[model samples]
Target: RSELTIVPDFYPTMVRNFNPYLATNLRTTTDFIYEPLVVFNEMKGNTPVFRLAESYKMADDLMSVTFDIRKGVKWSDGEAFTADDVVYSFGLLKAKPELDQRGINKWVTSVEKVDEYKVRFRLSEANSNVPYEISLIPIVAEHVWKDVKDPTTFTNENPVGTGPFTVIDTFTPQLYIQCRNPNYWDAANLEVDCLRVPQIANNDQLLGKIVNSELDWTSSFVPDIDRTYAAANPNHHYWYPAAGTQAFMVNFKNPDPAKKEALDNVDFRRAFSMALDRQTIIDIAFYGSGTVNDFASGLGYAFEAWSDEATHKKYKGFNTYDVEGSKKLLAKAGFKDVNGDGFVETPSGKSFELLIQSPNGWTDFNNTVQLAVEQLQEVGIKAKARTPEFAVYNQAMLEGTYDVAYTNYFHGADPFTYWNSGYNSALQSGDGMPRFAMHYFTDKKLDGLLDSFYKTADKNEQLAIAHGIQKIIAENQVTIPVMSGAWMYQYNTTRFTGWWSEENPKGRPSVWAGIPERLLHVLDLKPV
Candidate 1:
């Protein structure tokens, strides 16, 4: 009972790499072991929960910030956690731009140790959202990483951290185990002793394990929760919190000129959005688990706090499913069925097949893509679903080599982070970071708006800017918003007592969620 078995969202195979910097590494290290300075809970309206850092204060001028590191915390190896470690972690990222995935160096100028438990960060610009950026960085031990020459390729197979768990020797491609960190600051309060993570190859295997109670916790797209999973066991429970929006990311910079011209056209994209029935997608593909994305910005109810009634109302037509309207728009854009074929030719009078790509094993995404292709075909757009392995699909997305991909933008503490993930042009350049906005989308006005949001401290102004940004995305049809994404979390209450429910949801229930939420959720459980 002390051991909690978790099945993370399906990964084709497991690797031994625990490098926190590498996106491909299993989150065992970043989500469970390494500790961040602070944690933000989007569920609680971007609430800031202090972690390693007890407190932080931003300068009145917004040019710098200082953090008071927690005093008693120690690394899993029993080494004292100090301000020097915090300084070194930031320094490492600055020294190697590849490690700074969040672009911390973009705003941050320098990090200096004020004392053994205090550190100050100087900024290149007056930015008020510094805490949100700093909250994601996992603080690593200086002694362990400083010795390594190239931290980018150095897969820290044996990771040391201050979080509640530590990796053990019982590891294989099939499964791995992480035992409780005895040196953890709050070890006495920790009830769960070990975490068993088994690689889930597909949704069927995931559902089977959860139904049989083989998994204590997991986040997967199960067909019918009430009948398929929860009904199987009295203690089984699930919570589907609205997260981000699932959208079709059209490759704006697609190599094919004819295809690119059609995709890049705003009218063509708007028609594309209007062609599909989002409600049907939610009903069939998601098994009625999620809500329709009414906003063209793709910002769902989770981000309703920043919503502007006027802006959303202006773009309301984009969310409507109107086949006639779609045909009219396509006709206005010069697409026609010239060869007596049902499918329309490109504006250039050339026939091209549209490929909607999604990873093969992801059941919900594949289903969504299949449904989407059918809808597009109904509007005379030649479309087909491309189901490749996760690795192949992911590489294509990262390199911007695909036509259209089924992916979701990550939700963060605020609407800015959500927009930034999907539309930030800065992330696409010189740095080795993966282009999160894989659509290859960029607009000078959009870039300027994002910069304005980052620089402004006034809440009212920030809200106004958020509305403007949303308006731009809706107008451009940068990405077709499909449905509000759900955090598909299922847990067994027989072995653990403190699982997140609708009434008392404190952290994201998913094991694959960002830092502290994933760790804190596990830490909250007490053996039943």
Candidate 2:
């Protein structure tokens, strides 16, 4: 049988090695080889499915969670997998602050090995995310990583992983070959014989590949595919991802003290958000492919499904576009055209430029920001757009250095992850810094709701908290959610016929397509 051809977003070198802790490799390449303790089975939302972990028990107070490691598992290198490996991975993550950018370690007091197959995790506070936090953590063999002097710099060539696939070949920019692991714990169930990732030199050939059955899977956002290949070809399908969102982060606490008042003022922020014509932006930038997003995180489609009619109607009212209404709000907030120069000025007679920053080379974001500038100009607000290198842009976002920036929102499959990413003050500002996403935006009431959100396992209670949080953020205009784009995940069904799609709901496989969450798809995929 021919190998299943897959295409990643970048060349093979973009991923450094098989280091699970490194973000680039985590869910992309390394995850195919390595295993996580637990993972989300999106088919059963919020239900933690056991992977490397066989089962787990949490304390009544939720202070600790203990996991029973799966037995009879071995790394690709043939080393026996045990609780010791789990303990070692946590230790390494704790030692290197750089690796724990998500601030997951803040809730952890310590990780202790209870026995050969059991491990105990004590937390600083009760957190429902205990299961998933550990589930997403990449478990590496202690034997392999113990001797490494620098964890960040280590290439981790020829990594020894415990997942369903084993890397059999690495061909630089051309190809990366991995065969089904003969000794995988679930090897008997896995259907695919091999997974081949080849560089996509010409995206123009994508349509032909889908039509002729030359490619099985790809994660690129192809423009207007439905009007073109999708309508023309019946052999393949392109569908939206069930998770994630594309949004803009307004600097609530701007770096400039002179503009800090305007940035932090709730009414001013509300006026600013109401000025954007999101539908128009989506039409011009995404070719009418995006939805108007209101939630702080996750896909608008998922949020719509989760929210009740009352909650839905309420959120729809907030941050909506009304040019005249926005002008009134701005004037009510003490902004005036003092010099009649067609730009709003503060009561103190000072006018400031609202800079919308996105990473360079991102055409969609560039186009969106340009339209945003024009929209704001019609309402007499001074606005500009800047595109910087990816590295520079990300650093500015993380350090809260930018006035306004574009950052993605990936809610994973859990609402907990989304709430944590958007509202967790401790995580929003990393490493004791008072600035991060939304420029260190935090509220006392929101903090209490977050605590209850994290502390409880009750689905109803969690949903209530989530709804409440959405209400607060929407009303206060904490961040402006510009637009939402459906993930253009395209897959062919010629050589590899059984793939995930809307019809086959179990195939909610993501772009990265690694992680234990998608193991079901690996088992479900079959050779035609």
Candidate 3:
């Protein structure tokens, strides 16, 4: 029953108050301790892994979904896990619509408990994939949460969970220790009885932990990782897959209406996409351990069933780094270097500076933008890269303060989730439609296609719609895809024997957090 130690690159915040509604809490601690109704494997592609739900049945018309809760399961507090908890959690999300980042509230009309172990979800619309999306909502214990005045503000000091590990002590921000819950409902076959995930300051400190065997598992993309601790410790292993895409989020909703029109043009956006040296960024910024990505991220590997050769071919050649083509596109869009400063201006002779941004402290992102600016400069675009404070950068993106922001997201169990973010204009705030970090992007035709994508049950139709969206996004350059790679995780197996690998690839490590599947990999680790 020894403790397995871990060294995360940065310290996670609020391990004490683990709330899924707040993204940070959900990422740092909630995902480890809370159980989702069902889980989807990114590796398996849209295959549901029923966990809390014993089985799920969708109505023929997709008006409702019935879920049979796993019988004989108990909460960490030893209370029976029932339909009440499911209903209560759903109610919390419905009441606080602002906290519900996902469009779960829009689809789910209401939740009703059919019986003690049964729950039914009535949908507002006909969506077969809504069940999959709703399955991600973490279920909290009714006994514990029902009486809490403000669930969001409550500090869950001694958190009760249905997960494998339970907190032993709350020490500091740098460290939070936990022991395997002896009362884990699923036969409790865990070999490692305790765990420690410590947050260190820098890569040197993290590498030192692994070298000294003070770490067992971590997920970080460090430069020249092949020469790190994994090189020395034969037992230490690393695993990665082409899981997500790294891209630049162009601010389509630039406050300046004239500039917005300039960026909105498909030719101008395509030129920007073609201007980026994706391979160079993958080489210099990512240490050459990545792949060229499209609007769908690593579509071929992540969604092989749908992203066939035809789908891949459709988005190819758009981001192939063509400087001359970029100039032609700008010129065609009524831009020229009027002042002879080697920077282009609008045909009306209006010159503007493009500021490319990425969150500060992320060395890889800083380097990516540094290279991207140089490439843009070569195309006679007055571009400069800036690394802003993380908080400021995030606010800038949300408020549309920057011209281009380096963004990496869009890894969802269903392609609809990814597509919806870019195209769904249902949620609008103050005359501006909030989109998938791209700011305001509105097209009635694209919206219809996205709506149809979720409503249909046919796989062929879904793929066709996905293909159509992919074409539109690629041509318009929804976000310039820089590079694509999996969650590169380093795990020292000197203490644990069951780290996920190519042969034993049960689940990925963390998947950049907010992913429920991370707990699957954590559950399988055993003491060596």
Candidate 4:
């Protein structure tokens, strides 16, 4: 009753730095980890569970966390999935703390095994991550990786995992074929036997392949969805994707102190916020399938009101249409028009340019940004996109050289670990994240709040801390949570028929690149 087809906008590089620990540049790690856990579980949220670890428990103070990995789960190559692999991953992070960007410092703490199926994570008293880290994508096979000499040097072209699918074949970054895991633990629940996640760059090539029924599933590159379907009538095949956070991150420490002050100004940030027109961008860029904020039902409620208007929430958890109020806030900030320019301006200048960098074939890489540019220009701010190749753009984003950039903001389900303070202030002229990863807002107040956020175990107290963080970040407008991208997808509906999608705006559900084992029974490609 279903099929899956994967077609990407760009060609994935053929390099073998496929380990999640070292997979800093590839966005399609979904393909690598989807079958098991890391990035997603197709219909599930982002959390490493069942495959590697069946369950986890935290200490009363969250100072220590323990994991209970599944028994009898074997690596794709038949080796047993054990505590060694989990500890191995932790050790990698500990040994090369520098490479663990994206605020992985929370995971770099002491890792020890209590027993064969039990693992204990000793956290710094300062670290209070609950539900574990959401951003961490754990991919390891102790059997396959035990002899691997160096974390950075080991180029695993085709590694092993415990997902429903096994790497049957691979042609570097361009093509890959994974057969369903016959020895899979949860074989009764899968929808497909084999899941082939591929990267085919050319649009015409993709259209031709899909039209001819050569492909089964399609991934993130939905730039011209309408056009691709223009010459035909497969709108029925077209499905709306869920949302993910697309945000505007401002650099706190700009070269100019005045600019820094301007950025820090609440009025200016609100003015910038008011400048954006959600509907127009969705219509013009996304061809109408996209929503403005992550809160739309079509999307998800990202901005759920927790308390009174004075206390707002972050990630807009489930609501984001506060236009009139946003306008009033901007007006209150004294961002009124001057000299009849049809836009508001600060005393600093009339035009401000933002360097926008993104990967290739990403329509949002240009479309979403231009939407900001147009709206920003209306508010007397000049915006520009500095898009480079995926590799170059990856390095640039990691380096934090742009005045502004288009990026995905995913939250690990673990609130404590997800918002840890390490990745926030890496580029404060001498900060660590600037030279590392997750480089965003870094202030003492934020630092203190973030530190305090994890130091609590009480539900009401944690909620209080989280709410305080929400107010701190939103009130200051550190990052504007835009349209959570629709993780919409379609698969080889012709040849196969077991695929599903979940409405998690944060890009957690792995239905696209994952399977339930039983679904694999129908997949003709399932390994015999």
Candidate 5:
């Protein structure tokens, strides 16, 4: 009852480091140790929950934001948590652009400590979503990190944090345990004393452990939950929250010029999108755990408030399942069956074979891609599903070497993050070469729209710009959205209580979720 075991839905083989800034490290339990200034709960309509910072206020001109740091809080090493730590963390990101994983360094000009508990951030432009970006960067202790010469490479095996958990010396690549931080700001209320995380190699291993009742919590995909998982124990429960969009990232810059010509055609992309049966994929591949994405903009129903009704209605036909319409669009793009083999050839009469790439062991994505290929084949497009190993698949995606890679686009509190990450040309170059630009899709107007979104403080102006960006994506079929991505969360209630539910949903219940959402439920749970 004192310890809880978690199996996060990520790669096993834990890296032996606790550097909060590094994207490759195991952040499953690090969020519990290191903390962010605020937590933006996307599930709850982007509500702001303060943590390290007590409160914040924006300048009238929208060029700066000042934060009042929470006092009486101390790091695990018993050092005072103040404005200096906040300033240092932001400065670190600015200095080491490689550590700016969240892309916050682009908007922030400088961070200065005003007083013992007050910090101010100067902006490069008028940005209203500063808090949301600030919520992503974890604040580290100035005392511990000041002497570390190379932060990008320094693996802080012993991390000093202010959150409710602390990493102990019993850490290993196979498994590790996190002890409760005695100096946590609210340690008096913390009931769970230890967090045990073991290496989970595959879904089968995770499922076996869950069935045997060895796992207290996990974020994994369990097929036929009523018969396979929930019925195994009275305490077993799960909640799959639809939070993002799963889509096929078309490679516009394929090395083959003929393939690139077909991919670059807007009509070809739109026909490709309309040829698939998304509802069937959701029902069969995902086990009816997801919603069909009808919006061609890649924004789900959650962002309907920001969508322009007329524009969405005009472009909604691209996402519909119509084989005849798809063929008509393909023919218009100069694709036809010259050999009378039922399969269409490219514009230049070259044989076209669409390779839908996905990782081999990801059963759900592989199944989805296979079903999608079948649907595409029915429409006379010679499409085949390719399941490569994880390393090779990721390399192909990064190197832009494949056609139609299976991927997902993340949606945050707003649509800006989704649009910016996918369409921004600036991210295509530099140290982080195209972090989210796997599609290799770029447009000048799209970049301008993202810039306008960042420079405007008015909600109405931002909404108008969002509509413009959505129309561009929908018209061009930037990415073919298949179904809504679900946040898979399963928990056992026999040993501990206070798990988030539909009625009492505090935030995303998954342990792999961002920042304080992952930290909050762990700290709130008590031994039953």
Candidate 6:
């Protein structure tokens, strides 16, 4: 086997922040830090199997909880991967008020290490399912992370981990050079000795360089590239399962209050959802390879298979373009075109201008959002998709500033980390309740349900919370979800063979125990 020479996606910003806690974008120095725990050989959308902790118990009442961890797990630096690491992460995250501006991590009352290998948590309140919320946050090594005080200023110059791959060297954000860990528990199952993901150098540049075979594969690209590149090159391909639900989130709070009634009204929301052409957008925005979904992060479930007969029925036959239903609903809501301009209007005679914010780069990111904006305009609703830098866009999403926004996230932890307030709000600066990136959210009912869900335990109970809140979300009709981008990437054919597979990723299998259905088990290639 020869050395693996692989380069990944990178553009103007190459990469952004990598501090696991501070990681707002995919391409960052720290995004590759700690691999979250998962059960090997399990189904997707299911709870990730946890390591370090041997087992956990929650009283049926969900009032109290306890945890036990594996005794001898060690950090990359040779220190024990202990409860102290958890304490260290929890403490460091909260110590600096400035780090979490929204108070996302406040639910944790105390992160105390009971035994050397054992740790216990005391929550402010108990809900059976709340522990799952906290589990999404991977523990960090105190010994390794302690050296860096200020998160933003501290670059992971010496990145280390207990996962299958250990970062031996790297350049800012774009380049990564890591070696396979012989000590990796699942090393025997993995095929590749190392895994590499680099920065985006633009699609054209990638196309030009692929000829030299400097790189083997690219994960995903813009809609146009998906069409031209995938078709032009026999080796290049596109796939789906893109993480996070893509939607055109409307923040009715846009400055144009006159249009507010039509744009923000439930009738308009449903109308907007109904009027769009899903097929065309997928072709134009995603280049025809993505699918649409119904929910946002589903509690802690990851693409978990469900047996709900009614679940499918909920959104059954609901799709973009139901002109009759949309009009009926609009009139039912008392919205009529008083001026007879051929479009419905609110009593205020207002026309709403919704500001849709989304990522500027990545063809799929911008195109999908823009498609929604145009679709809304067709219904006499005004919408504009605003593209900004990843960080700026992330801040906007977290702050709840945009009326309708399209954002992308690499699913790293439990879906709850994307939803649970107690666990997520810890990232916020003040209260620990989450305001995901920049949720254009301000609803008392939705707010109350989310607060309650984090504290409740029990499958059906949690499901009930999920179901109720989902209904509210559905009614708000504020968002139109598209399919998860299988943000596809390919390994350099000559230089590399294995990758960070979702299951058994990098053969570690310890993190989320994700095992891809099709593991490229046979390969003879290496980086020169």
- Give the alpha carbon lDDT tens digit for every residue of 1-528 in model 1: 388998765677778877888777776777578878887776665667888889998887889999999999988888999999999999999988888888899988999999999999999989889877888887889989989887888888788988888757478888889888878887776789998888889988887888888888887788778898878889988887777778888999888887888888888888888998999998898788887887888877777778887777777676779899999989988999886789888888988888899888899999999999899999999988999998888788778788988886666767876788788888766545554577888888888898888676666888788888988888787888887777778889888998887877786678873535777787788997
Model 5 residue 198 CA deviation in Å: 5.1
Q: lDDT by residue for model 3 over 1-528, one digit each (tens)?
A: 578765433653425556666655524455556777787775665677878888888887879999999998777788888999999888888998866768689989889999999999999988888877887777788898877888767766676777766656546766777766656776365566666667676777776776666777777655566666567768767776566666777777787655666566666677777788887888888787776675433343455545646646665666677888888888887878888999887666777777888888999889998998888888887778888897778777767767878866666675665567645656424444343544566667777887788677666778788777666655555666676666667777777777777777666565345567766776687766
Give the winner by lDDT: 1 or 2.
Answer: 1
Query: 476-523 in candidate 5: lDDT tens per residue?
Result: 788888878777889999899888877667777888735357777787
Q: Write the per-residue lDDT of candidate 4 for residues 214-299, one digit (tens) a residue.
A: 66556434446666643344422444544445566565555545445456675666556666676666677766765466321111
Model 5 lDDT-worst window of ten: 428-437
lDDT of 4 at 299: 18
Clashes of 5: 0
Best by lDDT: 1
Off by over 4 Å in 4: 1-49, 61-63, 75-80, 84-110, 123-126, 130-161, 167-176, 197-204, 230-272, 285-290, 294-447, 457-461, 473-488, 495-498, 502-528
Q: After superposition, how far is residue 173 of candidate 6 from its true place, in Å?
A: 13
User: Residue-wise lDDT of candidate 2 within 89-169, one digit each (tens)?
Assistant: 888888887777456688777899999999999899877767766676677889889988888877676777788877565
lDDT of 4 at 149: 81
RMSD of each: 6.5, 5.9, 5.9, 7.6, 5.9, 7.8
Error of 5 at 67 (Å): 1.6
Query: Model 6 residue 147 lDDT?
Result: 75
Q: Residue-wise lDDT of candidate 6 within 423-494, one digit each (tens)?
A: 222344454333343334356676666677646555566666666665655545545555554435454334
TM-score to true structure, per model: 0.69, 0.71, 0.71, 0.62, 0.71, 0.62
Answer with 1 or 6, whichever has the higher TM-score: 1
